[PDB]
Amino acid sequence: KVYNDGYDDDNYDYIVKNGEKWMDRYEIDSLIGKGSFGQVVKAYDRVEQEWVAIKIIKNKKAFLNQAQIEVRLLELMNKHDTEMKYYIVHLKRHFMFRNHLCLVFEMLSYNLYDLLRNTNFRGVSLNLTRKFAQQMCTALLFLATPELSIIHCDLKPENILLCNPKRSAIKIVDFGSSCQLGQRIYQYIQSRFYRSPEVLLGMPYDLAIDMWSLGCILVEMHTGEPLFSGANEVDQMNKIVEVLGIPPAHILDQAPKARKFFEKLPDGTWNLKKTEYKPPGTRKLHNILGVETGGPGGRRAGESGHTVADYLKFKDLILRMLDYDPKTRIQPYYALQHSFFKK
Ligand SMILES: CC(=O)Nc1nc2cc(O)ccc2s1
Numbered sequence: 001k002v003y004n005d006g007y008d009d010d011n012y013d014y015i016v017k018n019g020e021k022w023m024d025r026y027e028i029d030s031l032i033g034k035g036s037f038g039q040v041v042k043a044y045d046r047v048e049q050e051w052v053a054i055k056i057i058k059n060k061k062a063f064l065n066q067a068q069i070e071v072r073l074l075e076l077m078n079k080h081d082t083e084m085k086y087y088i089v090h091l092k093r094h095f096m097f098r099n100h101l102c103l104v105f106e107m108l109s110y111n112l113y114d115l116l117r118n119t120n121f122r123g124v125s126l127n128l129t130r131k132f133a134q135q136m137c138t139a140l141l142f143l144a145t146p147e148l149s150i151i152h153c154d155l156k157p158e159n160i161l162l163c164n165p166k167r168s169a170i171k172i173v174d175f176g177s178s179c180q181l182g183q184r185i186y187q188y189i190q191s192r193f194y195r196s197p198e199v200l201l202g203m204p205y206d207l208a209i210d211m212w213s214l215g216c217i218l219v220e221m222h223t224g225e226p227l228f229s230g231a232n233e234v235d236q237m238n239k240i241v242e243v244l245g246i247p248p249a250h251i252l253d254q255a256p257k258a259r260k261f262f263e264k265l266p267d268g269t270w271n272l273k274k275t276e277y278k279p280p281g282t283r284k285l286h287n288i289l290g291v292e293t294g295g296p297g298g299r300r301a302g303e304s305g306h307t308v309a310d311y312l313k314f315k316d317l318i319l320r321m322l323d324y325d326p327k328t329r330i331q332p333y334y335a336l337q338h339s340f341f342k343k
Pocket residue numbers: 033035037040053055089105106107108109161173174175
């Protein structure tokens with residue numbers, strides 16, 4: 001057939017042609033990303049004389065209305081004066097072109113998933129991990145701004161991008177999967193490896209779910225492997241319990257999805273209902289991180305800024321980000337005051 005006068009494919013995406021001239025302004029170079037939303041292209045702005053990333057949304061009502069929500073969250077974000085907003089990807093402008101909504105961003109570099117691939121999944125250093133952590137904590141402090149109160153809701157290595165390949169600066173991308181605070185509309189949220197216990201349990205949730213994901217992300221950036229690599233939801237909770245033990249009963253008594261993972265015994269205590277896992281809380285983060293044995297797999301033995309003390313600081317901060325209780329889970333402001341970041 002012919003879709004959108006031949007500009008679209010049979011899947012509502014714009015057929016990207018390299019070297020195409022848009023509105024006597026944008027020079028399309030090449031595609032750098034893809035997803036259900038549509039496509040992301042690298043291109044040169046002839047007016048501002050700089051490279052830009054252009055997120056071309058699918059020519060369809062559903063994907064259009066989601067991108068419009070993202071536009072309004074990004075435009076609501078750049079109303080604020082603070083310098084913390086530049087840990088979020090900056091939307092420069094947006095427009096309709098051949099029936100696709102196009103969001104124009106600053107051009108960023110590789111994502112943190114690409115970075116882990118570059119290490120052959122052995123992780124980067126604790127020194128670089130700390131700079132990613134301090135920057136993400138500030139990013140989350142900014143999202144916690146009362147007038148924003150934005151839950152990114154899908155934080156993962158893929159959605160954190162380096163500004164530049166020769167620097168440690170990072171920005172968060174993709175606020176099309178946001179679940180902004182308030183009335184609970186969504187329950188199946190967050191990508192599984194980084195999905196919080198309150199989400200797994202079917203419980204109310206808030207901005208604390210992004211801090212959980214960050215805890216997970218940060219350990220992964222130093223080990224090189226995902227911390228809780230569940231193939232399904234049951235396996236995900238089981239991998240969480242391996243490291244952190246059985247979740248507190250006060251939470252499980254309130255959890256609608258309690259019985260998907262756990263069973264309440266005659267004595268009133270909760271247990272794993274069986275379905276190959278280490279016993280509750282015996283896969284220690286102290287040992288996953290290699291606190292006293294020279295880091296993950298001993299690969300950081302003798303590296304500067306990888307002393308036992310440095311590792312205990314990191315461990316502690318991470319354990320505070322993986323508190324089972326979303327109420328006492330460490331908040332952005334206090335995370336930034338942790339001795340892991342203290343000069
Ligand atoms: C799904 C999604 O929004 N992906 C995005 N990828 C990039 C890459 C950039 O360099 C700048 C902005 C964005 S947004």
